[PDB]
Design a binder for this molecule. Structure first.
Ligand SMILES: CCCCCCCC(=O)Nc1ccccc1C(=O)O
Lengths: 267, 267, 265
């Protein structure tokens, strides 16, 4: 099933399924997990379009520690893989902070090559100070596991969804302080540089169609910030989903797949 | 599940299952797919004999581009693998144009080491002009994908066999122009060099038992050609199957495995 | 299946679970990999974090590795678990993987390795048919006969499906190099120590050790275990009602429970 290519001199794991014409779905996971984040959505995505599920460097089957990297590399690697696989136009689907690389990829290639982007459960406000507090705790060699269990318990929010539970408990092993510390750095730095992902989006040369789908962030006035953003910018849309967890693509695979297909159709 | 060894400086993916006295079944796929082309046959083959499924160079999990190669490397890599495992006598089961490499193996090693060869749906006549056109089309950098989609339509006809449809749609990703173009050159050169696989078989120093099992060229003069070849060559046998597709090992795995097992019994 | 380089060699593993306490660490026999524990894994990973470990040369990459024995098998596994930030752990080890589990326990002490579970390791000196296969599998000119003898001694005319499938279909991909090394290393352990029971008696600081088996289904064999357990309160044993030499595959629920009980103490 799982194939690899060397891109930018590092090993990128992926799989490539489907032959329908049109834009390719490219799945991009969050930090510390791999293309199994999209097992639930995959049957629906691959029926609709060629779907390429992409792993970050250091996240494939080879779990040796890699040279330090962040969002520039995640985007350079994913783009290099797609050129090698002769993927022309494509629609990134990106989980939480993988959204940052998805937007970097959209900015580098333009709206004809990347006509749309879906983001799942990415904090659109500036970084809350509780979050920044945990981003530092996972950079602590003696307490990073503490920070991880803390982030996870709030991601689960006491769900009973077996897909989400199994994925967190069982399907994201083999990472440790190196990768969790790096996630801390890269995320912490992304919010310090841009302020928030919405400000990153407004800095896009020619914004493609962007859709944020989420269930957690809040309740909430988080929503009015989206309405507000969506009213300012025709290319932005969004959809609160009513899941219990930070993992809408796993908790609600058909609905999220439906959203991606709709997003693609529109563009 | 899948293992790799370095043979002739390249990575050869394979898997090895079964423990039974006698010859070993060695599965060989066509161009641009891997050992999952024998997932359906494998239960029946491994119950009968030790079975080694072999990928070509560049077709394993590592999908980095490799240097140019043809039938000679395919044959030498496979032999090198089996020598590394100390497999003694074995029976290649080869899909379509993997059959050229199976005959070259049989020729190199002779009929005690390779007492029999099974080939699955390999055009035994000279290449039809419409096939030659397709082989040239997959060498065109701008239209290779059209050439492929045309071939696939041929191969599926109107099937609703899910094993075959899933194999072609979903289980054969991760290849592009480098490999499809190479298949075109190599298959084209083979028909121009030998005229046809049947002429190739007649050039064998000491022919082993060779069986051709096929569904596709429609019934008619193709079967008469096979009747004539089998009347001239007692070491040759053939079976037309009732399938719709170019993939008898995937569409009719039980029946093709029984044919292999019967071939081996008789040699 | 994931890999890491440890001590210059590729160690394949997988890592599942997050419950606190000691980590389960599975160790397969010669010529097998993690699949030896597919059946117990659902039970183990629900109870504790579980790391299934392959020996060097036994993972997906089947290129030949530097010659090695128990010492390297122990050090590669320790090195992996350190890279995975595993602290205390309870090895579960099939047959002659048990020698490496005992070495790991010896090296690390009874706090980091509070218990070891071994699945069907002949606790007497080896029987003559087995010893003859250990020797034949080392002989360049007859090793395949040695391997067939070894495989026949594993199977013992059983009819259980999971175990037939495991032995027949999950031990491929090895050649003379690794099959001869198994014979060499197993025979060397019996030559060095006499028996696994003598090896355990040599432990600096015996942890709890439980032997789980269905075969050697005699009377003299349970006597041996009774005598040894009378002499040694850290030793326990459970004879299950299976027919095969692979309790973790034949009776995965019952083995996993014995492991979970073992860990509890
Ligand atoms: C992406 C789905 C592809 C499935 C690959 C199966 C390969 C195969 O069966 N045949 C050929 C491949 C290249 C050129 C000619 C042929 C021919 O069989 O005539």
């Amino acid at each position: 099933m799982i194939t690899t290519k060397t891109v930018n001199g590092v090993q990128i794991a992926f799989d490539d399924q489907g032959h329908e014409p049109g834009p390719v779905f490219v799945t991009l996971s969050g930090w510390a997990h791999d293309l199994r984040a999209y097992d639930g959505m995959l049957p629906y995505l691959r029926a609709a379009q060629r779907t390429v599920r992409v792993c970050w460097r250091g996240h494939g089957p080879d779990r040796n520690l890699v040279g330090d990297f962040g969002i520039d590399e995640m985007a350079a690697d994913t783009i290099g893989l797609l050129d090698a696989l002769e993927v022309d136009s494509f629609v990134p689907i990106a989980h939480a902070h993988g959204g940052w690389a998805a937007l970097e990829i959209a900015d580098r290639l333009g709206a004809q090559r990347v006509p749309a982007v879906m983001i799942l459960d990415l904090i659109m406000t500036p970084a809350p100070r509780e979050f920044v507090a945990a981003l530092h705790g996972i950079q602590d060699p003696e307490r990073w596991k503490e920070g991880r269990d803390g982030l996870v318990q709030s991601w689960l929010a006491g769900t009973t969804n077996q897909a989400v539970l199994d994925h967190v408990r069982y399907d994201s092993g083999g990472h440790g302080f190196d990768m969790w510390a790096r996630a801390g750095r890269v995320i912490d730095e992304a919010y310090r540089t841009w302020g928030s992902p919405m400000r990153r989006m407004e800095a896009l040369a020619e914004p493609c169609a962007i859709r944020h789908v989420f269930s957690h962030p809040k309740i909430g006035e988080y929503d009015a910030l989206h309405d507000d953003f969506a009213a300012r910018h025709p290319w932005f849309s969004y959809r609160r989903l009513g899941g219990e967890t930070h993992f809408p693509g796993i908790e609600l695979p058909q609905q999220v797949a439906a959203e991606a297909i709709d997003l693609l159709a529109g563009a």
